[model samples]
Structure formats: C-alpha cells, structure tokens
Target: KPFTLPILTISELTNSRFPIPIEQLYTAPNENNVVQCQNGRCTLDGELQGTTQLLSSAVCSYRGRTVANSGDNWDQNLLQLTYPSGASYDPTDEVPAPLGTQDFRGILYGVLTQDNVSEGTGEAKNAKGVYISTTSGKFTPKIGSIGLHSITENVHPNQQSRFTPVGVAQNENTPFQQWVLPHYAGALALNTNLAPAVAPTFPGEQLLFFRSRVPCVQGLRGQDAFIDCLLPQEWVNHFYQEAAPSQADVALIRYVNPDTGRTLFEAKLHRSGFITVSHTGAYPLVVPPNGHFRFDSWVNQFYSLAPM
Candidate 1:
C-alpha cells in the first residue's frame, strides 16, 4: 500500500529533490529522543509509529537529516546525559536492565576513530584499542566479545557481557523513530567543518564499539513502509562468515558489494540536513563517497533545494 506525502510541492524547483521536514513528516517528538544515528532512529521493533515520548533523554542533532536543533549549539561534543536519581544501575559500569528503559539524557554520540587507533595504545598497548564515552569521557569497557553467536541481537537479554548493545526507543513514531534517511546517520562535527559528520570509526569501518544499542526494525518487518530497512539473511550470514574474525573493510552504510559498484539500495544526503530517500523518488543518482553525482551546490542545483 502506498502512503501519501503531506504536500505535492516540488521541494526544489531548480533540481527538485530532498525530503519534507523530518520532524513535520509525522509529528514532533514531545519527549526527548535521540534524532540521529546513521540512517537509524528510535524505533519500536523496527517501525516508525509516530511522534511520541521516549523513555530516555535522546540527544538532538543540528547535523543529521533534520535541523531539529538548528538554534541549539552544534559544537558541543561530549554527551552529558541527565540520568535519573534512584537509578540502580550505573551507566558507566553496567547497562540498565529492562532494556531501553534508562534515558540517555544527552544521546548525541559520535565515533572515536582518530584517537587510540594506532599500534601501542593503552588498553591494547601492543595492538589496537577502541573506546566509547557512553557514560563519561572515561573508557571503562574491557574484553570485547567475539564469535558469531555472541554478537547477535538475541544475546542482549540472556547475557550480561562487558560491552552490550541495546535497541533504544521510547516509542515507534515519526521519522526519528523509524530513522530512515534512505541510509546514513549524521551528527555535529566539531573537529571538522561538516555539521553532521559520518566518518569511519577507525580500525574497522564499523559503527558502535561498545554496548550502546542501535535501532533496528524487528516486529515491523512485514510492513511495506520499511521494506528496505529489513536485513537480508544472506547478508547476515555473509557478515558473520566474512565479517566475523577475518572480517574485511565492510562499511556501516547501506547494502554492500561496493567493489564494482554492486549496491542494492541508495539515497541522497545534503550538507544542509535533508535527503532524497523515500521522499523524492524510489531511487536517485548516488552522491559523494558512493557515486560521482557532483559536489558544487551553486552549479549543481540538486546539491541543495527547499527543506520539507
């Protein structure tokens, strides 16, 4: 079944591209929710329900596909989450039980690839080391789990490992909940000029290094609205088979096989914070780092257009 957009107006008359307002696409999230995480959002079992309140305090981005925090500061890098009192679990020590219940007050997190990546680091002094500042700037996680079954989403509840990833979302509603920019998460880029920096998280071109959960469509797998977001069994098998221990330089983006450009899905991202993914057309020309669409916004009209 096809759903209707809010308006039929051409977002960009010059080139005619870009999605409507991510916030306005559905409804604004009254409760605090993290807005950006690559091409993901605070979802409920893998579907966008609508704008609703989140269990935790989600960090907003002045960077990603939406300017929900346009007036707010984008320079702040550190995430200072406002944890609630009487909270039994310490965010730094262990993940809060009853998954996705604890509020990540300042949910604006970034990849730490530049530092502590080289050989002879502290944790892996002789080898390489990776760390994430989920609770505070201090890296407390140690002994990264290995093996294929150990990394599955199912193990989150049964096991209590040092590093655990949890699916976070108070409710499934709005673009922020579904989190589909066609593909790609964005956030403030303080070190670089780019507002929503989607750089590689060094060592391995993976996403998160620690136990913070990212949203994935689980229950809503049958819906047509999120058909593209669903993961393929072959892809997962290939990932575990290839990306297990002897993993290659697989990225944290859309469908892989970028060797001879054997991509399965696509979307367009704007530095101005918008995308032509599930909005303008079913598919469009690939943008930078993927395909050579063009970079000059002034000369190339598609580089920028009206915001939805």
Candidate 2:
C-alpha cells in the first residue's frame, strides 16, 4: 500500500546543474514511536526496544548501519543486559541504561577503515577510521541522559569460538564485557615534547613511542596491532585460502586521563609494534600530572569482515 507523500511548498528558484521541482517537501518528525504504514497512512506500532543499553551509545560514520535485535520476532522481553554492578538483565523504560550503570562510561563500536595510509616516518598523517552501526530501527535517548552510547561488533556471536578472531581487551582489572573483540580495541601513544624527553622520534613518520612498563613491546604490550586482520577461519584455512596480506599498519593512540575521559596526549605510530623510551631517544611516556593515565589503540586496516 502507498502512504501519503510529505507536504511540499513552492517558493524560490535554486541554482543547480539539473532542474529540481521548485517546491520543497516537508514532513513532521516521526514521533518517537515506530510506525507501520498501510492504506495511505502510518499506524503507531510500538516503541523501539533492545536488550542492551550499549545499543544507545552506538555511533557510526557514513560507512555504517544499525539494526535492532538481530532477529525476526521483535519481542522486547527477549532483550538481555549487563551492567557495571556485575549483573546481567534487561531494560524497562523507553531509553537504555545510563553510563553510571556500567563500569565504562561511554560506548564506541563500528567497522572502521582508514583514508590514506603510509609507511614513512614526520607529520601525523590524515586518516579516518570509518564506523558503521548495526541497528536498523530508530531509538531516542531517555531523560537525564544526552544520547545512546554503544559500540557494534562485526561478527554476531551465534557461532562457536573456532569461528571468531580475538580483537581487543581491557586490562585484567577491567575485563571487557564478554562482547568486545580484541581487534576493536585502541592503543595509546604519547607525545615526545614532554619533560625528561624519552620517546623515540620517527621523523617524517610523525610518530613517537612512549616508554612504559613494557619496553620495546609494540602495540599495547602483547596484543596484536593489526586494526583488522586475519580472522579465525582465515588462519584455520591459511593453506587453502589465499587471503590478502594485512594492510594493517599505522594507527592513532590517545593517552587519556583515567579519572575523567579527557585526552592527555595523542600520536600516530609508523607501524603496529612496540618501542622503548630510550630505544632511539630520551622521553618517557607522560603520566597524568595528578591522576592516573589510561591509553587505547585504534587499529587501522584496509579490509574487515562485519563484526559479530
């Protein structure tokens, strides 16, 4: 059935290569409710619902999309949630849970790819890791909250462990909820201009390594540095499948103040490896002048499968 067209008005002439209808089309904001269309009109169906508040914190770039509960029957009761209180459950109100309810305050998830990549070492290169959402429906934030905060995974977890690749993980003190992939994790980098200077300079590469507890260890200590790389299946079938070599090189690291999500220092790395403060220079990775510091790495890759 065809629904009614939006209202339109004819006012002035707008310049362009091709001629467009002089009239502009307009429509009322779709009320904060999902609508079903038929008989030339829309009917209020129900409120948008999800099991996890993380869905609300979701943000994606032009390369992303978002889906509700990856299923057929849109039953609200089926939704499940986990909070920082060390509990798992579901939501009741129209909006998802608040950040205070979770150990981590904000959410960031998506499928990302960089713009331009290089292998040389002076200026921070221009790049954008694209983010894509998974939810396919509309959701508005609840009061006392600004908006939904969440991240999305490329591979949905309906499969067995043998099928997925490990991404990023928080330090053992704060284990990422069961859903975060190791690869989706970001690493931290420090600026060399700090006092007692102890960071190696990758001139022309626009990157410097921060000295830390793990010396000469690239990429957040022991973790793999590829932003996106070989998946479990690829490694399993390495001999049979000719997968593309990993273009996973160069990435951005942000040193953050743990007390508050404020950034202390940030830098881009020439490659996904470790470095000692005195490896080539003399600058220590700067610590917060007062509070403790936490760092994260964002992997930069050319190809990635949809996150589960």
- Give lDDT for model 2: 0.22
Per-residue C-alpha lDDT of model 1 across residues 1-308, encoded as one tens digit per residue = 11111111111111101111111111122123233322222121222111111222222211111011122232212222222222232333322211222122212221211122355434532221112222222211111111111111121122212222222222132222333221111122111111132322222111111111244323334332211111111222222233223111221123223345554432232222222322221222222233211111122212222222
TM-score of each: 0.20, 0.17
Output the number of the lDDT-best candidate.
2
Tens-digit per-residue lDDT, 1-308, candidate 2: 11111111122221010111122211121124122110011011111111111111211111111223344232111112223232432333332232122111112222232233375722433221111111212111111111111232232222111101112233324332211211111123211111121122332221121111111111246542211110111111221233223233433444455557676544442231221111222233434444321223334533121211
- lDDT of the candidates, in the order given: 0.21, 0.22
Best by TM-score: 1
Give the runs in model 1 whose Cα sits over 4 Å from its true position.
1-176, 179-218, 221-292, 297-308
RMSD (Å) of each candidate, 1 decimal: 20.4, 27.0
